[PDB]
Design a protein around this ligand. Structure first.
Ligand SMILES: C[C@H](NC(=O)[C@@H]1CCCN1C(=O)[C@H](Cc1c[nH]cn1)NC(=O)c1cc2ccccc2cc1N)C(N)=O
Length: 227
């Protein structure tokens, strides 16, 4: 099936991504605390709900939160400032907090149930967010022997997410806090975010040889993100 794209709200970042984030893929954003990962997640959760000629997919959202960082009022602000009803936008986001990494893995299985229900409705699930993908794995799997065990469990979690993306035509968007590399990763596309000067955020594609090699620049605003 043909893939869909979701505009991020920034034309610069959209060009870096070839039009937006893709369905049938996992896009991982990574960078230090404060680099804009969660604001990009909030913006995408609104953008995907727009019609396709405005860069959305007329889609619903599912959001797994490991750090209590989802903010419904920020959704409402972004929606209002993009011409959308804030409470309708919120109603098409299903939200769950993952208590630990094993609960996080179970929540991906639960998510399939709602995905199936909405699949042939006018707003099927088109975006599944995991913010943060790695935080519980990093606190639970630590010390001698933990590198191999943690990487194996992560890879299985990511395989479950790839299955949902590919089987149900969903964009999976995940965040990863990284304090300034040797570990393997299995996301489809990895985007490094960082702070720039003048309040700007800078994005670069990592290990993607046949895609754009420049950098996108964006700001965080009342519309979420924009150039
Ligand atoms: C934006 C937010 N929207 C809600 O609160 C809307 C209102 C109506 C129910 N909503 C939910 O999110 C419900 C709350 C709930 C939990 N158990 C029973 N009901 N989510 C779920 O059911 C759920 C979500 C998942 C997300 C990802 C993965 C697996 C999930 C599995 C789940 N069971 C808001 N602030 O208004």
């Amino acid at each position: 099936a043909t893939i869909g794209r979701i505009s991020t709200g920034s034309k610069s970042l959209d060009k870096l991504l070839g039009g937006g984030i893709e369905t049938q893929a996992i896009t991982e954003v990574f960078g230090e605390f404060g680099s804009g990962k969660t604001q990009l997640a909030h913006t995408l959760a609104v953008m995907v709900q727009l019609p396709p000629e405005e860069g959305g997919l007329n889609g619903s959202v599912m959001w797994i939160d490991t750090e209590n960082t989802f903010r419904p009022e920020r959704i409402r602000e972004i929606a209002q400032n993009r011409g959308l009803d804030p409470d309708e936008v919120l109603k098409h986001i299903a939200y769950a907090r993952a208590f630990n990494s094993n609960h996080q893995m179970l929540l991906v299985q639960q998510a399939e149930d709602m995905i199936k229900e909405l699949l042939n409705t006018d707003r099927p699930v088109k975006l599944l967010i995991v913010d943060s993908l790695t935080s519980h794995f990093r606190s639970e799997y630590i010390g001698r022997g933990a590198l191999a065990e943690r990487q194996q469990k992560l890879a299985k979690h990511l395989a479950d997410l790839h299955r949902l993306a590919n089987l149900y035509d969903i964009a999976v968007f995940v965040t990863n806090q990284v304090q300034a590399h040797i570990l393997a990763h299995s996301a489809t596309l990895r985007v490094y975010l960082r702070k720039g000067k003048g309040g700007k955020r800078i994005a670069r594609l990592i290990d993607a040889p046949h895609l754009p090699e420049g950098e996108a620049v964006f700001s965080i605003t009342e519309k979420g993100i924009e150039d």
